[PDB]
Design an enzyme around this catalytic site. Structure first.
Site, PDB file in Angstrom:
ATOM      1  N   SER A   1       0.780  -1.218   0.000  1.00 45.35           N
ATOM      2  CA  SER A   1       0.000   0.000   0.000  1.00 45.35           C
ATOM      3  C   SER A   1       0.819   1.277   0.000  1.00 45.35           C
ATOM      4  O   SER A   1       1.527   1.526  -0.906  1.00 45.35           O
ATOM      5  CB  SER A   1      -1.050  -0.029   1.097  1.00 45.35           C
ATOM      6  OG  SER A   1      -2.269   0.428   0.638  1.00 45.35           O
ATOM      7  N   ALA A   2       0.669   2.058   1.040  1.00 48.57           N
ATOM      8  CA  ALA A   2       1.419   3.262   1.243  1.00 48.57           C
ATOM      9  C   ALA A   2       2.891   2.939   1.353  1.00 48.57           C
ATOM     10  O   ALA A   2       3.700   3.704   0.979  1.00 48.57           O
ATOM     11  CB  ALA A   2       0.926   3.997   2.466  1.00 48.57           C
TER      12      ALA A   2
END
Ligand SMILES: CCCCCCCCC(=O)O[C@H](COC(=O)CCCCCC)COP(=O)(O)O
Ligand SMILES: CCCCCCCCC(=O)O[C@H](COC(=O)CCCCCC)COP(=O)(O)O
Ligand SMILES: *[C@@H]1O[C@H](CO)[C@@H](O)[C@H](O)[C@H]1NC(C)=O
Ligand SMILES: *[C@@H]1O[C@H](CO)[C@@H](O)[C@H](O)[C@H]1NC(C)=O
Ligand SMILES: *[C@@H]1O[C@H](CO)[C@@H](O)[C@H](O)[C@H]1NC(C)=O
Lengths: 537, 538
Positions: B209-210
């Protein structure tokens, strides 16, 4: 480090750690599956031999969230948790009628200790004995003063426990969760003795639905709590529940839930709808019962599932049962958290006025009250921001406008002013049956919620944080089970007065406690008392 | 309970050896960003830190689970309640959070020279910590495969502590602090990992994700300069779910608006130096103020309040422009996606039921530099048919509200799955000789409503649950890649994973099997987005 016990039904194995030997998930009734689903429990006829309770017990099927009602995210979560892997991961099955026994260590068939029998609360939709661990509660009893046996039971909730209407009624299939509680009790009469329990030194403790349940037990069968000629319990502790007025099991609300429950379950149009449902597989089944509005919703405390008078198990509306002296009266301690309402007021942020509040009760809560009386009751309650719950917080904690008001109201009608009302009637028809009541304030100033519903389970039941409220409440309860009086047994810092004497109650802060008049919000209390009947939910 | 300890250039730590793994949790890598250091770039320790007990659980950086000022009332209530000091203490959460965890096989010495896997957690730039990413299972797998490694998991600042923007932040040189935390941590590894038995020349960075987006940003940082003291910080990257995210600048309209809001909430408005007021605000009030803005668990969804934004130095330009200009450190990489990236993100915005509505929603929250015509055109590449959407290949099922599957698909593609293809294409164009491998994960197919959803890889791959074909093959592929720089070299693998650029093929991994397939699905969508990537700057 393992043990050991043999009993008339069977024999069991438990593990002892640090002075407590615990048996978890001991069977107490036939698993209500197959045809036994949706029918009263049955005690085991034939000895079940030996099982390990070294483990973690099961839970009956939960209803954390509605699969059919509420906001979309909640519905989604409700469906997902319902899937088999999740249930298995959490050990939840129709096979729930088990119980937990926890003892000091070394106790034996002659030990003859008193019994503490817990009933969990989940608003009749959820809860289990899995996370209520008896340990430092029992530890304090040992830590000084009076040792006891602890018993935690599981019982059917939602559709399993309390499905309603017509068809259930004819079958005498009403209020199964209640019956489960009763059969668990009977098992205690028969078997607890092998465990070094004293039968009929049994005190029943409940919170929320558990508390409402304790009163329902006293009420069962028009108040006969007699098993084999002996009283099932000797006392009752109720936290945050007691008398609940409900319309009959034959009632419009209950028949309707049952009607949509079926419709969801695809037994509709079948000749025998009821017969059919026990046909249905568990996952499909859970999903249908959970289709209804749930506690974590706008619906809030207008529960889809609760006990309802059926006229045998629950012969009448509970308030009437008190009036008519048709319950078993035993010594009791009853309590409320200072801010019972707040948690309940959060979701229905719709309800920004009395006119709004009124429609809300009229739509979902009480079909028996005219707009005229309800408007009167609510009006008993000020609009002033200061007047709401959390109490004594001034202009603060107003989550949305009217929240404090609604919270005071939901908290009062259901619990706090519900309690005094029970107390007044109980004083009237069974004076001389002693009682004590208290108010919890140890969580003052907690933002928005204050000393909220179920704060006790932590503070008292698990004794967190450790402080004046913890030692004190415990000592009283521990004394009560041991002696049948809160004030007797251990030495108590403050003598807790009988409620009926001066109508006083104890108020406990975190570090202090005090004696105060149980007279607050009198006009609201008064309207309710004079009018309890229209609030049949 | 056996302790073990390591002396290293900045200190000594005592860790714990259990069942063949030695763990040090909470090793500090930078000075605590408190006081004058709140909202400042991380600084290395100048003095020996002494001897530290790392036998426990380490801290986390401040969290933004839910908004304190936005969204549904229940969420706001919970968002405020989480921030009270008692809960913060309970979760070991504070501003003094710049620590990392180290895990290695039992018996590793300064002599060992193992490969290093550096993990960056994902929480949408708003939450997350290393606290719940334990390497024991992955490490156990490597050891069993004959390819042991050292696992490193970092903490970095998130939300307002890490990603506050606006002009004042830019002027101070304090943009993208969370990226700087990651980088300084890589620099700590370069200095100090050899003491732990690790080879600093064989570092592979991995995130989800991030964290994944963060891996690309590390390649991007400082115009592609990943050298410290003359050597590369990492030699490979693994990206799970995310990579290039086009964004408006740190001093742009969205960023300035968020900052002004925070300042007003914190009681700093109208001070002579607002960014300086912010450093004097009490922690509870500051936290309440940063968490004041819209959160990921809201209608705004993946139109994030906090994220990396180009500042001209740390991140020179919007990330798509960076790849195009050959200004990133191009290293061998693995990139992948869960088949159904957007389903989770499409749950909350359930009033978005039409082309016109989707466009309105994007124009309002997401893309300020795209016209209605351009957006409508992109949206129309997605069919309205229930079968077409996400969860993909589930037919008439899983349609949570009408248009949910379409919205999930769009959200999934622009952010994740199609962006990945666009990234792959650009890199191959400017860096043809740098290998890349890609795949699609389908191991959770048939899961209701969400399918193989975002972050399902944390369970299946990072923790290997459940044990199956998918877990074994992926972990093995990842472990070989950490060890050799190729997913196919090392332990023997069932299916050779092709390089993407050869035929634009990817691995699609099911729970029990894998297949090679073309990365050409939803081509019209991809093509529009690829041709127009700039309009989608968030
Ligand atoms: C992980 C949190 C568990 C500890 C809560 C402590 C509750 C009992 C404690 O003795 O009362 C309080 C704890 O804080 C309260 O304001 C309420 C918090 C509890 C609600 C949690 C949902 C004791 O605080 P204090 O008066 O300062 O001694
Ligand atoms: C507490 C549940 C732990 C299981 C995680 C499963 C990871 C993938 C698993 O290996 O294969 C999945 C597990 O179920 C998945 O469909 C989705 C579950 C994950 C959602 C969690 C919110 C299916 O495996 P299989 O039955 O073998 O085909
Ligand atoms: C509140 O929302 C509910 C959702 O069911 C709906 O019944 C009604 O419009 C609202 N109630 C009131 C009293 O406004
Ligand atoms: C939009 O494009 C302009 C160029 O016309 C650019 O300067 C600006 O920063 C972009 N804004 C956003 C929000 O992407
Ligand atoms: C979606 O609903 C929100 C309210 O939560 C509203 O603010 C917004 O305008 C709506 N968007 C669309 C496109 O309807």
């Amino acid at each position: 480090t393992t043990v050991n016990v043999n009993y008339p039904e069977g024999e069991v194995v438990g593990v002892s750690v640090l002075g407590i030997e615990s048996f978890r998930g001991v069977p107490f009734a036939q698993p209500p599956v197959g045809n036994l689903r949706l029918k009263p429990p049955v005690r085991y006829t034939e000895n079940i031999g030996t099982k390990d309770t070294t483990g973690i017990g099961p839970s009956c099927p939960q209803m954390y969230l509605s699969t059919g009602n509420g906001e979309l995210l909640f519905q989604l979560v409700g469906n997902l948790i319902n899937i088999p892997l999740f249930q298995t991961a959490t050990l939840s099955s129709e096979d729930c009628l088990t119980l937990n026994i926890q003892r000091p260590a070394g106790t034996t068939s002659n030990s003859s200790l008193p019994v503490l029998f817990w009933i969990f609360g989940g608003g009749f939709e959820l809860g289990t004995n899995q996370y209520y661990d008896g340990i430092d509660l029992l530890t304090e009893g040992i830590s000084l003063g009076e040792p006891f046996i602890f018993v935690a039971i599981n019982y059917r909730v939602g559709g399993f426990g309390f499905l309603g209407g017509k068809e259930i009624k004819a079958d005498g299939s009403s209020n199964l969760g209640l019956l489960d509680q009763r059969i668990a009790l009977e098992w205690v009469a028969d078997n607890i003795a092998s465990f070094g329990g004293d039968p009929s030194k049994v005190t029943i403790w409940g919170e929320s639905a558990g508390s409402i349940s304790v009163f329902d037990q006293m009420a069962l069968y028009g108040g006969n709590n007699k098993y084999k000629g002996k009283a099932l319990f000797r006392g009752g502790i109720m936290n945050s529940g007691s008398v609940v007025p409900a319309a009959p099991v034959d009632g419009v609300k209950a028949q309707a839930i049952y009607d949509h429950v079926v419709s969801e379950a695809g037994c509709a149009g079948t000749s025998d709808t009821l017969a059919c449902l026990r046909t249905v597989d568990y996952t499909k089944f859970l999903t249908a019962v959970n289709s209804v509005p749930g506690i974590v919703s706008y619906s809030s405390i207008a529960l889809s599932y609760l006990p309802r008078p059926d006229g045998v198990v629950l012969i009448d509306s509970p308030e009437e049962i008190v009036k008519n002296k048709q319950y078993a009266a035993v010594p009791m301690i009853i309590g409320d958290q200072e801010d019972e309402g707040t948690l309940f007021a959060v979701l229905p942020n719709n309800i920004t006025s009395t006119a709004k509040i009124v429609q809300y009760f009229q739509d979902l809560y009480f079909y028996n009250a005219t707009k005229e009386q309800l408007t009167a009751f609510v009006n008993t309650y000020p609009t002033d921001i200061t007047a709401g719950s959390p109490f004594n917080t001034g202009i603060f904690n107003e989550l949305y406008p009217g929240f404090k008001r609604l919270a005071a109201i939901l908290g009062d009608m259901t619990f706090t002013l519900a309690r005094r009302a029970f107390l007044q009637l109980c004083s009237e028809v069974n004076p001389d049956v002693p009682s004590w009541s208290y108010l919890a304030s140890y969580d003052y100033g907690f933002p928005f919620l204050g000393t909220f519903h179920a704060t006790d389970i932590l503070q008292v039941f698990y004794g967190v944080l450790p402080n004046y409220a913890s030692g004190s409440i415990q000592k009283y309860y521990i004394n009560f089970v041991t002696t049948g009086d809160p004030n007797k047994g251990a030495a108590v810092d403050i003598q807790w007065p009988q409620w009926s004497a001066k109508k006083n109650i104890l108020q406990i802060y975190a570090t202090k406690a005090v004696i105060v008049a149980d007279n607050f919000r009198a006009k609201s209390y008064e309207y309710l008392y004079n009018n309890w009947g229209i609030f049949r939910i």
